[PDB]
Amino acid sequence: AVPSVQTFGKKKSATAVAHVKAGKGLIKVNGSPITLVEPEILRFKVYEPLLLVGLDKFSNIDIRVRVTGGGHVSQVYAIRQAIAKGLVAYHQKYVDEQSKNELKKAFTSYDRTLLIADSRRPEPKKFGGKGARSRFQKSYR
Amino acid sequence: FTPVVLATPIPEEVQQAQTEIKLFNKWSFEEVEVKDASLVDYVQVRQPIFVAHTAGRYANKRFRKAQCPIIERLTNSLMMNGRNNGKKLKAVRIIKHTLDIINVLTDQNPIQVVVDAITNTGPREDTTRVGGGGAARRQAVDVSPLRRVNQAIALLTIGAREAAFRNIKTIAETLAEELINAAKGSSTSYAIKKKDELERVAKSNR
Amino acid sequence: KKKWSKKSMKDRAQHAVILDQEKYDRILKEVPTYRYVSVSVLVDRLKIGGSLARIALRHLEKEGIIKPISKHSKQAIYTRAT
Amino acid sequence: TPVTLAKVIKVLGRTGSRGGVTQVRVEFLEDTSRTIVRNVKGPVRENDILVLMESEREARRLR
Amino acid sequence: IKIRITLTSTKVKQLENVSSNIVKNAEQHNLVKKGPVRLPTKVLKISTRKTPNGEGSKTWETYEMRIHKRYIDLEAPVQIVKRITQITIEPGVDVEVVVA
Amino acid sequence: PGVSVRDVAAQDFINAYASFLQRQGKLEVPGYVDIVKTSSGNEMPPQDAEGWFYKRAASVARHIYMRKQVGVGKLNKLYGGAKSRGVRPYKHIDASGSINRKVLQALEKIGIVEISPKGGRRISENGQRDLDRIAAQTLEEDE
Amino acid sequence: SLVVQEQGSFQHILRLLNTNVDGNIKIVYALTTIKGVGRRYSNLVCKKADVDLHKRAGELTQEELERIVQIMQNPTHYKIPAWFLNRQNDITDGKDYHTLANNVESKLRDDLERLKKIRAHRGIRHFWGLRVRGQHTKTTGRRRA
RNA sequence: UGACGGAGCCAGCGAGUCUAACCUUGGCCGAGAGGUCUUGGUAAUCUUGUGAAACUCCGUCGUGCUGGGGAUAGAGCAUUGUAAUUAUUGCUCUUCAACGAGGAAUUCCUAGUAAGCGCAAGUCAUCAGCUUGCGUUGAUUACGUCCCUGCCCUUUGUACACAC
RNA sequence: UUAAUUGCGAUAACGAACGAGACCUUAACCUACUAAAUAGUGGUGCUAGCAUUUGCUGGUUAUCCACUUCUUAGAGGGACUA
């Protein structure tokens, strides 16, 4: 029985589970270090939860995240949400509220999407057009 | 400094990014003030961001689009012209590349250059349809501060996009030249010339 | 039929495809004065074709003066390093 | 460009043949206590400082 | 002997009590078993034009039908395949006894 | 430490393994390297000319390391892409099966990928150790 | 730096296989002007000739253009795939051929005339001027006369 | 904000053979289409993690009716069928035409929506530029009006009643 | 006033019916229940690679143990503008 917690996260259809146990500071996604994203532009977008509050709270935890589904940005949004919820979960089974409550206040003070998932989902396509609102080109004469 | 190295190491530059707020990793959001009091509270520069790629809930109501970073609005408005629909990963790449040229040439803070450019190319007076009943007829009216920012961003984006049409210069330098020239209020800017046309038309039909 | 459009480019001033000598002295003494230099800058002002700036932009970056502020995909931004 | 910084205190209502302009009761920050009505094309709610290039023209409903 | 009770139907309520009766017969006596496994519902969908002729605005339809599949895993000797084999079958749902 | 193929970026590792495949060309060189188009969707042969075979071998071996079993059709689907069918819209087209077959057999000859049960190939025991040794090198080259 | 100067051997224009070959462009693409040689065949010819692909047409030593030229007129002798030729299994003899700048157009007229003389469907429609591959012509192919 | 050549390379809906011959994994042959010997599956189980594309990083190129664009044709190689000829379709080479942002006019659209992107299913022995659905990237622009095109209620006028 | 003859209310009208609404399905939430090698997760054994110093990345159904956060559902909760 070694200390550990688990979380989840979605952006549009992806899933990302962070088994944040007690470690020496290892942040890995699909077996690769956190510094290897893929868009190489949203690398600081997934670096977010690392840098809002500081790296000192990250020195006694190891976040292992597995992601499935969605586009490359959707995977990135899944990773950042999972690690952000993973950080609070580690603070939601061991550490005090002052550590957690200002952790969980500051995360949403910058952006609500770190903990709260995006509620918007794709809408079903309706007959008569290529999309839901869109319709085929109608003409007269 | 804080030299904390975890089990998975992170470069010291990223560790440096935790000192100040996001900062686009090289460019101060602070010390950047909108000169015109008219466009205050509508050009969002106080809230910082690592990247200009966020899934904000901005179009649901009327005025949350004002609570959007001005840099992000530039990336959104650079995403036009048909085939270039989506591809937001590209749009921030020119923005990063264009924003760099604003630092290499005309060495001030590029964020400051962006905000003063949009405040100097936003039309203050505009004409409207009033044809009522009788072929046509114009009539001059005023422009809201929100519309001033929206028109300013649109003019800058279309000007650089058109000037990059069938030309060796890439959109990165074309955006940089358009913003720099509009920043210092020179006549060669497409946006500045367009602002002159709308203001003169409104002035004539006053 | 009718097109209602123009059909003309301009006047193609085709220039160096293989680097010569009389402009080799030019480049070594003229680009170190560029506060901003990139592929397109010497294409316009120095009047250089396509597959010579990329070699020239690789030339000075490896050898001397101008320095990689931001060299990346489809944009090689270099300054007047001094 | 002599402009006048004026902040609205009340919006009358959207006007025009297509509803592209709005009547607002607006007062000037400098030389206050003087109130005029002006037209706005863009969205305006309250406390918006519109750059008035000319400050002397009474506004009215437009056809 | 690895008796498995497979149930497929279109009516969820009738399939639910059959599983409930089977699981209630299972938890009686001893019958250590595995509970109802909830397979994803197979949703057939045939999209067809409403118009029998060709005239009319394009108005399509979707006639769907949901199949609910749940299997019950038993583990016991012959002294319950004299007992489980007494089918508690309602209209609709069907049972297929599979051993090993 | 504990570096491995997953502790490295893709571009640096594939080039590094291509670097440690050109210097001694032990693996193989097929006779039709300079005439293949890599697929029926691609319009032009690769511009690498001299190489591009150990580059694919480096990518294939790295792909094998993170997985368990693949097939030649799996490599064809992965290495394929959209095809410009004239005025008709684009469509996904599989890669050239012979090219991936020659690469896969070539990796078997050196001893980096061998056949696995339940079908397909799998990274070799000698293959795993040398590929991991590559990762320990490419990180320290930049250091 | 991969920078080299020029002494004067650059020629702004070439003439291979009795046709104009403009310089100032890479050799792999400057040979596409020849009637009957495309991007792939020119790449194949240049690859087997070892002509340093990243070389302009003007900046080419004369000893390499003849080697390229000889490959053009006899590809099958220089280990070129039999499936890399435009005229395969010729109706006259059957040997795998490769028509050239003047041979591509001339041989095209012969096969149409052979098709026309035999009064086949393709031959008569070619003389008529309509489509010969079965396309629709009701709404397409209008501005032709 | 491009094309091309390398790499990274992530989805969802759904379908699939019994007395038939479907979805096909894997190995081998062929540049490719495709062929070959087998395997798994009546299905969350096997096809399939449908390793899809748009996307991103390295390079090639250059403002060039050109490496844009692939109509128009010539020759060859295979698949489907009793049969392909006014080429079913697929693959290879070659020919490389109009088109440089489109005139009067007109279509759709207020959020994951438009648009860009591909996939599955329907028709199917073979043939998607179609349709029905699915997911991927994801803007600007309104929070209003009856000015234009139409609708509902009331008042009013009518020589209309197949009713402006 | 409302998307709505949808309501407040007025009132030679009262009481009503159909439509709308209500209802059904789907998309979202549940770290609360029932569970589950035809979905997974963690752990114990077998075993591989890098470093060996403490670890990391893996493979492995008869190696077993534990769980349902993610995966599917059935019974339910939640949203009424508070």
UniProtKB/Swiss-Prot annotation, chain A:
GO molecular function terms here? Answer: RNA binding; structural constituent of ribosome
Pfam families referenced in this protein's UniProt entry, alphabetically:
Ribosomal_S9
Localization per Swiss-Prot or TrEMBL: Cytoplasm
Q: Which InterPro entries match?
A: Ribosomal_Su5_D2-typ_SF, Ribosomal_uS9, Ribosomal_uS9_CS, Ribsml_uS5_D2-typ_fold_subgr
> Crosslink site(s) for Glycyl lysine isopeptide (Lys-Gly) (interchain with G-Cter in ubiquitin)?
K28, K45, K57
Instruction: List all disulphide bridges recorded for this chain.
Output: none
- Listed NCBIfam families: PRK00474.1 (NF001749)
The family annotation for this protein states:
Belongs to the universal ribosomal protein uS9 family.
Q: What does this protein's UniProt record list under function? A: Component of the ribosome, a large ribonucleoprotein complex responsible for the synthesis of proteins in the cell. The small ribosomal subunit (SSU) binds messenger RNAs (mRNAs) and translates the encoded message by selecting cognate aminoacyl-transfer RNA (tRNA) molecules. The large subunit (LSU) contains the ribosomal catalytic site termed the peptidyl transferase center (PTC), which catalyzes the formation of peptide bonds, thereby polymerizing the amino acids delivered by tRNAs into a polypeptide chain.
From the Swiss-Prot or TrEMBL record, give the protein name: Small ribosomal subunit protein uS9A
Q: Which organism is it from?
A: Saccharomyces cerevisiae (strain ATCC 204508 / S288c) (Baker's yeast)
Swiss-Prot record, chain D:
User: What does the UniProt function comment say about this protein?
Assistant: Component of the ribosome, a large ribonucleoprotein complex responsible for the synthesis of proteins in the cell. The small ribosomal subunit (SSU) binds messenger RNAs (mRNAs) and translates the encoded message by selecting cognate aminoacyl-transfer RNA (tRNA) molecules. The large subunit (LSU) contains the ribosomal catalytic site termed the peptidyl transferase center (PTC), which catalyzes the formation of peptide bonds, thereby polymerizing the amino acids delivered by tRNAs into a polypeptide chain.
Q: Which family does this protein fall into? A: Belongs to the eukaryotic ribosomal protein eS28 family.
Q: Which HAMAP family match?
A: Ribosomal_eS28 (MF_00292)
* SUBUNIT field: Component of the small ribosomal subunit (SSU). Mature yeast ribosomes consist of a small (40S) and a large (60S) subunit. The 40S small subunit contains 1 molecule of ribosomal RNA (18S rRNA) and 33 different proteins (encoded by 57 genes). The large 60S subunit contains 3 rRNA molecules (25S, 5.8S and 5S rRNA) and 46 different proteins (encoded by 81 genes).
Which Pfam families does the entry mention?
Answer: Ribosomal_S28e
Please give the superkingdom of this protein's source. Eukaryota
- GO MF terms, alphabetically ordered: structural constituent of ribosome
Q: Where in the cell is it found?
A: Cytoplasm
The answer to whether UniProt assigns keyword Chloroplast to this entry is no
- Keywords, sorted A to Z: Acetylation, Cytoplasm, Ribonucleoprotein, Ribosomal protein
* Biological source species: Saccharomyces cerevisiae (strain ATCC 204508 / S288c)
Modified how: N-terminally acetylated by acetyltransferase NatB.
* More details: Present with 94500 molecules/cell in log phase SD medium.
Transmembrane as a keyword? no
Swiss-Prot record, chain E:
Keyword flag Ribosomal protein: yes
Q: How is it modified after translation?
A: N-terminally acetylated by acetyltransferase NatA. Also partially acetylated by NatC.
User: According to the entry, what is the taxonomic lineage of the organism?
Assistant: Eukaryota, Fungi, Dikarya, Ascomycota, Saccharomycotina
Example GO CC term: the record gives: cytosolic small ribosomal subunit
Q: What is this protein called?
A: Small ribosomal subunit protein uS10
Which family does the entry's similarity section mention? Belongs to the universal ribosomal protein uS10 family.
Q: Name one GO biological process term.
A: maturation of SSU-rRNA from tricistronic rRNA transcript (SSU-rRNA, 5.8S rRNA, LSU-rRNA)
The lineage's top-level taxon is Eukaryota
Protein source organism: Saccharomyces cerevisiae (strain ATCC 204508 / S288c) (Baker's yeast)
Q: Gene name on record?
A: RPS20
From Swiss-Prot, chain F:
Question: Which effects follow disruption of this gene?
Answer: Disruption of a single RPS19 gene reduces cell growth; a double disruption is lethal. Depletion experiments show the proteins are required for correct maturation of precursor rRNA to generate the 18S small rRNA. A specific site between the 18S and 5.8S precursors (site A2 in ETS1) is not cleaved in disruption mutants. Partially assembled ribosomes are retained in the nucleolus rather than being exported to the cytoplasm. All effects are exacerbated in the double disruption. Increases association of NOC4 with 20S/21S pre-rRNA, decreases association of ENP1, TSR1 and RIO2 with 20S/21S pre-rRNA.
Result after altering R62E: Loss of mature 18S rRNA, protein binds 20S pre-RNA complex poorly. Lethal in double RPS19A/RPS19B mutant
Write out the GO MF terms: RNA binding; structural constituent of ribosome
Q: Gene Ontology cellular component?
A: cytosol; cytosolic small ribosomal subunit
**Annotated protein name in UniProt:** Small ribosomal subunit protein eS19A
Q: Which GO terms describe its biological process?
A: ribosomal small subunit assembly; ribosomal small subunit biogenesis; ribosomal subunit export from nucleus; translation
Q: Which family does it belong to?
A: Belongs to the eukaryotic ribosomal protein eS19 family.
Q: Does the keyword Heme apply?
A: no
Which gene holds the coding sequence for this protein? RPS19A
